[PDB]
Paper text:
Therefore, we set out to test n-Decyl-beta-D-maltopyranoside (DM) (1), geraniol (2) and its synthesized dimer (3), as the mimetics of myristic acid and farnesyl, respectively. ITC of geraniol with HBc showed a slightly enhanced micromolar affinity (K_D_=94 +/− 8 µM) ([Fig fig2], [Table tbls1], [Table tbls2] and [Fig figs7]) and a stoichiometry of N=1.01 +/− 0.04, implying that all four hydrophobic pockets of the asymmetric unit are occupied simultaneously. To confirm geraniol’s binding to the capsids and to resolve the molecular details of this interaction we conducted cryo-EM of a mixture of HBc with excess of geraniol followed by single particle analysis. This experiment resolved an additional density for geraniol in all four hydrophobic pockets within the asymmetric unit of HBc capsids ([Fig fig2], [Fig figs8]), confirming the thermodynamic binding data and further defining the underlying molecular interactions of the involved HBV residues P5, L60, K96 and F97. However, TX100 binding to the hydrophobic pocket affected the spike tips, by flipping Phe97 in the pocket, but the geraniols resolved within the hydrophobic pocket did not flip Phe97, thus suggesting that this cross-talk is ligand-specific. Binding of an (**4**) or of (**7**) splays the helices at the tips apart similar as previously reported for binding of a P2-monomer. Encouraged by structural confirmation of geraniol binding to the central hydrophobic pocket, we designed and synthesized a dimeric version of geraniol potentially capable of simultaneous binding to the HBc dimer. The analysis suggested that the dimer engages with both HBc binding sites simultaneously, resulting, however, only in a moderately enhanced micromolar affinity of 63 +/− 8 µM ([Fig fig2]).
Here we investigated the hepatitis B core protein (HBc) that forms the viral capsids and plays a vital role in the HBV life cycle. The capsid is composed of 120 units of HBc dimers, assembling into a T = 4 icosahedron. The asymmetric unit of HBc capsids (T=4) is a tetramer consisting of an A/B- and C/D-dimer which have slightly different 3D-structures. We explored two distinct binding pockets on the HBV capsid: the central hydrophobic pocket of HBc-dimers and the pocket at the tips of capsid spikes.
Author numbering:
A (entry chain A), B (entry chain B), C (entry chain C), D (entry chain D), E (entry chain B), F (entry chain A): 1 to 143
The structure:
């Protein structure tokens, strides 16, 4: 069974394939903003929204991955494989969770409509040849 | 932030901490169940329910963990570390995800009321000593 | 084309694989059942029901496969090849036709509601740990 | 439990033995026509018609036989045996399956009364000695 | 994505796969026909019909292919390759575009109903063996 | 007969002559976004819009050109002419199809009104002398 974690929200993975991978901020940055903006709603006993319902799960899965990484650092004495596994986690799974958390936070903050429009516009930008594409990449803004 | 994945749905981890590991089916079995019963919805573009949302996220996180274990079995060359990490995944996070998938599937099937009452009754039963409890546990079923 | 032989009836091959292959009765037993209970209806000049139509066609396809088995055992002299081909036919196509004929006979005799709920229930039952399920396997009964 | 695949619709193997075996088209051509004209109806979750049900089952049985032929070509080492059985599966079976698909596709396109009138008339034509039958045989058409 | 250029219009390639190459006029002839009959529309600034849209696109693609063949005949200096590519174009894509232009022109002229019924009847005729079919094919015409 | 593939849509070739040739993204980029955004509508059996009706044809013609290029790579042994023809295709016909696919995708995504306004504004930009033209080239955006 294959599931798209955005189809439920009106998007797809080919639509987020527009954005490059080095575009998404650090998981730390994303979690800090998620806290600052939605702590009382994520720690709440309510189906505040599907985006909260899903952000909670993403945060908990990243927490389990962090627990795995620290478990490795404690147990595995072989530095080669210890570091290999920890780096694999933080790089690859970090990228996937960056995409996910970015989608959810940005949508909660701005609007899924605005976020899909941002995706198409950023696709325009990154497809445009450099000689003609502005340096002011599209930026999501409430102001 | 500290999140409880069930508070949003009306439960806690202290209400599921009593359920022993012997209670929970394989993760493969629970995934087969979820597929057979709710594939047309999980693979659908709808906020069918917070349960469907959370189940999608859980399935995807488990897929990520399995890909991690596979990557380990391929790359790592110290069987000590290989065994350690693969076992830790399939046991610890296997059990967490078994709890999760079971809670969601069972609520979807029976009802929040039914499942929470069953958790209460099973907790009474398992907090009771053998010599003072019936020998056959409580049971959730549709025949 | 990709046709699902049960989609037209409300089921799927995934749903019928929710049950093990060691649950379905032999083709001879199922054909005896079909004769006994619906001979004059399957031999009738009427669309008595879509289940009757499908059952007629499945009976005819299995008859052709058995005709092939006899033809092979007779003409094909190579014992190894006749063994392998007859074994493949029997085993594999028998699992398939066992699932099919079981579904059709059972639906005719009981109800699509009953038979689908039975598939679900028996799958959950056989995936559940023994100590937390009813002790007697589910049975599909008329009385 | 002898069953006539056409009695359920209003014909019988006697009425179709009128047409020779050299008459019926290639099974590939017939499946192409089926695709072209009824892909959406056969891949639909509806009892659109008994003809639809029967055609689905016929296509599926032919697919089973195709898988048998492939599995033979790969497993059976004896070239003689594999070629003999594959040539059988094609000639001897495809004959019946061509007859069947033809009946179904025709009675779906043109209708039962028309197909039966056509069978009677083609029987007249093909029974007439060659010295007295016109060159313009009966054709099954809409114009 | 896999597209069928006729599904949008109510047909398939399996419904036109029966039409043999001997059936289709020259591409030059079909283009002369399209011009003479619908130039005032194809050269017009209107969504006259999906057929006109598709016909415009087909004509332009064929013009591009002809410019390609011309560029080859000019630049390339190995007559082997020159012949190979020019012939491949004018035969393979010539035939595809003949199918296309014919379908569009004929639908525009006669009707979706008429053309699809003609395809059905011609497929019956061409799937029939010579000894069992009339000797003169079906015909689409306005006298 | 000369046809403008945009006059039907409210544009011209002198209007797109504004945009340079090195402005349009790769055909791969365009096809990827076309898939992600319009797969279910292009593979649909409906005149969803003239832009779909035309995008399907453009994609199919580019597919035929890719088939020609691979056919060349297989057949033509002479590397000089093989590479010459393949490069001609991918460069020149690629440019033409880039212009076309860009027009259609951008219009479906944003609005033909917005796209023509973008064309005139980009003409302003690229006509403006460098010393006074901003680096932030005009960019199409939903956000
Ligand atoms: C919520 C997800 C996807 C993972 C965390 C699982 C967990 C910590 C369960 C505790 O009972
Ligand atoms: C890990 C979870 C909760 C979901 C899937 C993450 C992923 C691979 C996204 C791809 O864009
Ligand atoms: C649709 C266009 C312009 C080209 C493709 C032609 C084709 C593949 C026809 C199959 O019958
Ligand atoms: C190849 C097709 C379908 C149309 C014409 C492409 C072209 C030369 C556009 C110029 O802007
Ligand atoms: C697979 C099915 C339904 C039938 C096999 C062919 C037959 C027995 C008769 C056709 O004239
Ligand atoms: C549909 C028919 C008559 C045969 C093929 C399917 C089958 C026997 C089991 C389902 O996989």
């Amino acid at each position: 069974m294959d599931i798209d974690p955005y189809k439920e929200f009106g998007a797809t993975v080919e639509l987020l394939s527009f954005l490059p991978s080095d575009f998404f901020p650090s998981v730390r940055d994303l979690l800090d903003t998620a806290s600052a903006l939605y702590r009382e709603a994520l720690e709440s006993p309510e189906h505040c929204s599907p985006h909260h319902t899903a952000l909670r799960q993403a945060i908990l899965c990243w927490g389990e991955l962090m627990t795995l990484a620290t478990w490795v650092g404690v147990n595995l004495e072989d530095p080669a494989s210890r570091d290999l596994v920890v780096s694999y986690v933080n790089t690859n799974m970090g990228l996937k969770f960056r995409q996910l958390l970015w989608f959810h936070i940005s949508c909660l903050t701005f609007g899924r409509e605005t976020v899909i429009e941002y995706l198409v516009s950023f696709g325009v930008w990154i497809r445009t040849p450099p000689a003609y594409r502005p340096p002011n990449a599209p930026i999501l803004s409430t102001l």
